[PDB]
Design a protein around this ligand. Structure first.
Ligand SMILES: OC[C@H]1O[C@@H](O)[C@H](O)[C@H]1O
Lengths: 420, 14
DNA sequence: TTACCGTGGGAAAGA
DNA sequence: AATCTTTCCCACGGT
């Protein structure tokens, strides 16, 4: 017999207490492939995070029902999706995150794009499911020609996210990633920051508030790097193209994936953003002999830039543990309002066993495909007892619910607007 | 079309 | 020490 | 042929 559907009381309980479980997958948008028997590791290393208060709540519920600490521990493996390459275990003991430092894609795989696959279950072998990263583009190696904006794929738009790493003399053990920790920038061996790269116009002054411009990042432009987690920023920088061990002052072609970059601290005396072991400092460049358009920079001042992405999934066991995996987790991108009032949901991983709930009111739902659903908007009187029309605006949460009670929250609300 | 950095870190010198 | 290994620069092969 | 991308090769300086 089928499992219990979500009750209105269970929905009300969730809406008060919350306790969502969230899986984040942070990773680069491209990856260089490996030939033969070699291993060219994904850099930065994909990082899985277990976010939100629901992990601790689930852990306590499980141990209440008689699980040991080890039985309640989440486990996770990661691999190339749809692939013969083996999965690799992630160690999450004592942490809510783990990086995958030795992934690579062999040229045995002929795909042009792929996804990472994260398989999760608890210590008592209770299943959680399989979570997919965003799509990752395979490259053979970065081109040496100037980047064309026709390949928007490999360019970097203002306001998107990048990682930055430094590596000394081709040694994998020396890789260090720009990262913010304890209110300070540092260069980490194990953790990496995902930084907004904001384009500023040339006359934009220093400050914490600044006007950002749209477009693709080019060498010679002024940029602001902002940690997407801490909000900490660096002073204004001029991103310059690295050629051998010199920064080119006159290059102005588009920045491309995996290019080597230098960051000149704007309005300084040839000071460049520079690592020294784990320390982040500024280090003065040396003028090149005869050539006035290049400056010699420190080993620590050359940074590989790479665009990064984020997959995020949120679920809640609204009627308790279930037999089916909670995956694939639906994600709602947008709501659009459309006889009867219909609300259209656009996103991914929709299934015909989902229903849209407005607040605690389950709505009639029409499945179309994995990216599109329609539902009928409940009468306002389902939320305001006497109203025969919308007297004042009324805002309710929009939530996806599966037929076995799994609850998939959205960040999105619906607002009944008064009739003018 | 305007961003808000929470804090701007000072970069120490060599 | 020897054996082994990512990595980046180049050579070679392919379109 | 010529030129850019893909694949193959290998040594530096790390474990
Ligand atoms: O002779 C080339 C080498 O010289 C150093 O400055 C660089 O790290 C290498 O390219």
């Amino acid at each position: 017999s089928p499992p219990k559907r979500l009750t209105r009381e269970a929905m009300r309980n969730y809406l008060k207490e919350r306790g969502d479980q969230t899986v984040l997958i942070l990773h680069a948008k491209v990856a260089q492939k490996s030939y033969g028997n070699e291993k060219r590791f994904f850099c930065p290393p994909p990082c899985v995070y277990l976010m939100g208060s629901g992990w601790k709540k689930k852990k306590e519920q499980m141990e209440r029902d008689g699980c040991s600490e080890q039985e309640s521990q989440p486990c996770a493996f990661i691999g190339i999706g749809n692939s013969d390459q083996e999965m690799q275990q992630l160690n999450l003991e004592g942490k809510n995150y783990c990086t995958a430092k030795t992934l690579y894609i062999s040229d045995s795989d002929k795909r042009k794009h792929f996804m990472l696959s994260v398989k999760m279950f608890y210590g008592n072998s209770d299943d959680i499911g399989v979570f997919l990263s965003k799509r990752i583009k395979v490259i053979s190696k970065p081109s040496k020609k100037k980047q064309s904006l026709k390949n928007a794929d490999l360019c970097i738009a203002s306001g998107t996210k990048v990682a930055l790493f430094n590596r000394l003399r081709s040694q994998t053990v020396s890789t260090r990633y720009l990262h913010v920790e304890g209110g300070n920038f540092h260069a980490s061996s194990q953790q990496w920051g995902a930084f907004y790269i904001h384009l500023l116009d040339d006359d934009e002054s220093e400050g914490e508030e600044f006007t950002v411009r749209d477009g693709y990042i080019h060498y010679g432009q002024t940029v602001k790097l902002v940690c997407s987690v801490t909000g900490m920023a660096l002073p204004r920088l001029i991103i310059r193209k690295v050629d051998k061990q010199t920064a080119l002052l006159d290059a102005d072609d588009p920045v491309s994936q995996l290019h080597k970059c230098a960051f000149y601290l704007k309005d300084t005396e040839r000071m460049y953003l520079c690592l020294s072991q784990e320390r982040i400092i500024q280090f003065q460049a040396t003028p090149c002999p005869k050539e006035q358009n290049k400056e010699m920079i420190n080993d620590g001042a050359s940074w590989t830039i790479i665009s990064t992405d984020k997959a995020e999934y949120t679920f809640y066991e609204g009627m308790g543990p279930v037999l089916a995996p909670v995956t694939p987790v639906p994600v709602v991108e947008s709501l659009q309002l459309n006889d009867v009032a219909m609300l259209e949901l656009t996103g991914q991983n929709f299934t015909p066993n989902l229903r849209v709930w407005f607040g605690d009111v389950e709505a009639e739902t029409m499945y179309r495909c994995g990216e599109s659903m329609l539902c009928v908007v409940p009468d306002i009187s389902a939320f305001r007892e006497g109203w025969r029309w919308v007297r004042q605006p009324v805002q309710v949460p929009v939530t996806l619910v599966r037929n076995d009670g799994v609850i998939y929250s959205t960040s999105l609300t619906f607002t009944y607007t008064p009739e003018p | 079309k305007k961003a808000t950095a929470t804090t701007t870190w000072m970069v120490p010198t060599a």
